[PDB]
mmCIF file of C-alpha atoms in Angstrom:
data_model
loop_
_atom_site.group_PDB
_atom_site.id
_atom_site.type_symbol
_atom_site.label_atom_id
_atom_site.label_comp_id
_atom_site.label_asym_id
_atom_site.label_seq_id
_atom_site.Cartn_x
_atom_site.Cartn_y
_atom_site.Cartn_z
ATOM 1 C CA UNK A 1 -0.159 0.307 -0.182
ATOM 2 C CA UNK A 2 2.751 2.475 0.227
ATOM 3 C CA UNK A 3 4.295 1.352 -2.518
ATOM 4 C CA UNK A 4 2.063 2.932 -4.589
ATOM 5 C CA UNK A 5 3.017 7.239 -3.560
ATOM 6 C CA UNK A 6 5.508 8.324 -6.636
ATOM 7 C CA UNK A 7 5.220 12.273 -7.205
ATOM 8 C CA UNK A 8 6.747 12.369 -10.814
ATOM 9 C CA UNK A 9 4.970 15.290 -12.133
ATOM 10 C CA UNK A 10 3.831 15.859 -15.685
ATOM 11 C CA UNK A 11 6.183 17.224 -17.626
ATOM 12 C CA UNK A 12 4.834 19.660 -20.756
ATOM 13 C CA UNK A 13 4.819 18.236 -23.841
ATOM 14 C CA UNK A 14 8.229 18.992 -25.883
ATOM 15 C CA UNK A 15 10.761 19.830 -22.936
ATOM 16 C CA UNK A 16 13.707 18.401 -21.572
ATOM 17 C CA UNK A 17 14.246 15.796 -19.148
ATOM 18 C CA UNK A 18 15.223 17.519 -15.475
ATOM 19 C CA UNK A 19 18.027 15.782 -13.821
ATOM 20 C CA UNK A 20 19.330 17.682 -11.084
ATOM 21 C CA UNK A 21 16.643 18.148 -7.758
ATOM 22 C CA UNK A 22 16.842 21.867 -7.361
ATOM 23 C CA UNK A 23 14.297 22.493 -9.777
ATOM 24 C CA UNK A 24 10.668 21.724 -9.313
ATOM 25 C CA UNK A 25 10.175 19.701 -12.115
ATOM 26 C CA UNK A 26 12.255 17.001 -10.593
ATOM 27 C CA UNK A 27 10.208 14.790 -8.224
ATOM 28 C CA UNK A 28 12.619 15.047 -5.362
ATOM 29 C CA UNK A 29 12.427 18.735 -5.119
ATOM 30 C CA UNK A 30 11.052 20.192 -1.886
ATOM 31 C CA UNK A 31 7.989 21.516 -3.637
ATOM 32 C CA UNK A 32 6.902 18.122 -4.800
ATOM 33 C CA UNK A 33 8.239 15.991 -2.154
ATOM 34 C CA UNK A 34 4.673 15.402 0.437
ATOM 35 C CA UNK A 35 5.559 13.388 3.698
ATOM 36 C CA UNK A 36 4.910 9.685 3.801
ATOM 37 C CA UNK A 37 5.687 9.227 0.138
ATOM 38 C CA UNK A 38 8.137 7.260 -1.717
ATOM 39 C CA UNK A 39 9.745 10.877 -2.639
ATOM 40 C CA UNK A 40 10.902 11.599 0.727
ATOM 41 C CA UNK A 41 11.803 7.470 1.474
ATOM 42 C CA UNK A 42 14.363 8.600 -0.901
ATOM 43 C CA UNK A 43 15.066 11.790 -0.076
ATOM 44 C CA UNK A 44 15.635 10.523 3.222
ATOM 45 C CA UNK A 45 19.147 8.769 1.883
ATOM 46 C CA UNK A 46 19.812 11.553 -0.266
ATOM 47 C CA UNK A 47 19.520 9.895 -3.699
ATOM 48 C CA UNK A 48 18.772 10.875 -7.618
ATOM 49 C CA UNK A 49 16.135 9.303 -9.593
ATOM 50 C CA UNK A 50 14.276 10.341 -12.225
ATOM 51 C CA UNK A 51 10.864 10.496 -13.639
ATOM 52 C CA UNK A 52 11.416 7.239 -15.881
ATOM 53 C CA UNK A 53 12.845 5.366 -13.036
ATOM 54 C CA UNK A 54 9.963 6.255 -10.754
ATOM 55 C CA UNK A 55 7.186 5.510 -13.209
ATOM 56 C CA UNK A 56 8.736 2.499 -14.105
ATOM 57 C CA UNK A 57 6.835 1.344 -10.695
ATOM 58 C CA UNK A 58 3.505 0.433 -12.551
ATOM 59 C CA UNK A 59 5.202 -1.677 -15.024
ATOM 60 C CA UNK A 60 7.154 -3.209 -11.934
ATOM 61 C CA UNK A 61 3.933 -3.883 -10.017
ATOM 62 C CA UNK A 62 2.763 -6.576 -12.486
ATOM 63 C CA UNK A 63 5.140 -9.055 -10.987
ATOM 64 C CA UNK A 64 4.433 -9.860 -7.534
ATOM 65 C CA UNK A 65 5.353 -11.994 -4.348
ATOM 66 C CA UNK A 66 2.442 -12.752 -1.862
ATOM 67 C CA UNK A 67 4.262 -13.056 1.220
ATOM 68 C CA UNK A 68 7.419 -14.615 2.930
ATOM 69 C CA UNK A 69 5.961 -18.542 4.305
ATOM 70 C CA UNK A 70 8.312 -20.773 6.530
ATOM 71 C CA UNK A 71 9.259 -24.161 4.711
ATOM 72 C CA UNK A 72 10.629 -27.017 6.591
ATOM 73 C CA UNK A 73 11.673 -29.973 5.182
ATOM 74 C CA UNK A 74 13.326 -33.016 5.806
ATOM 75 C CA UNK A 75 15.313 -36.346 4.055
ATOM 76 C CA UNK A 76 16.798 -39.472 5.013
ATOM 77 C CA UNK A 77 20.165 -39.739 5.231
ATOM 78 C CA UNK A 78 22.343 -40.077 1.686
ATOM 79 C CA UNK A 79 23.439 -43.572 0.680
ATOM 80 C CA UNK A 80 26.434 -43.219 1.684
ATOM 81 C CA UNK A 81 25.806 -43.796 5.534
ATOM 82 C CA UNK A 82 22.163 -44.733 5.239
ATOM 83 C CA UNK A 83 21.330 -47.999 7.020
ATOM 84 C CA UNK A 84 19.142 -49.995 8.922
ATOM 85 C CA UNK A 85 19.083 -48.080 11.783
ATOM 86 C CA UNK A 86 20.240 -44.975 10.183
ATOM 87 C CA UNK A 87 17.344 -44.513 8.148
ATOM 88 C CA UNK A 88 14.933 -44.009 10.913
ATOM 89 C CA UNK A 89 15.986 -40.364 12.398
ATOM 90 C CA UNK A 90 15.756 -37.742 9.614
ATOM 91 C CA UNK A 91 17.436 -34.191 9.064
ATOM 92 C CA UNK A 92 15.333 -31.025 10.252
ATOM 93 C CA UNK A 93 16.168 -28.029 8.609
ATOM 94 C CA UNK A 94 14.551 -25.089 7.687
ATOM 95 C CA UNK A 95 14.516 -22.064 5.381
ATOM 96 C CA UNK A 96 12.395 -18.922 4.359
ATOM 97 C CA UNK A 97 10.576 -18.435 1.305
ATOM 98 C CA UNK A 98 10.355 -14.534 -0.150
#
C-alpha cells in the first residue's frame, strides 16, 4: 500500500527531462516532496532518481509476491551412510521463501 505513492509530475510537451533535484520539475524537489510517500523515502538517503525511473513502478508491479512463508524440509541420510538404523532418524532444517 505504501509502494504506490510516487510524485513524479506531468512534464509539459516538448520539454527536456530534468536531472538535478534543485528544480521543481524533478520529483525529488522540496515543493513536490509530499510526506509519507516514496519521494521522502528516497530523499531520506539523499539519492537521485528521475521521472521515468519512478514511473517504472507501474510495470514493475505486474510481477508480484504474496508474502514470506516458513518451509520445513527433511530427508533421509545419504546413501553413503544410510543403513537399517540410520534411515530411522531424519535431518530437520528449514528456510524462508520470499
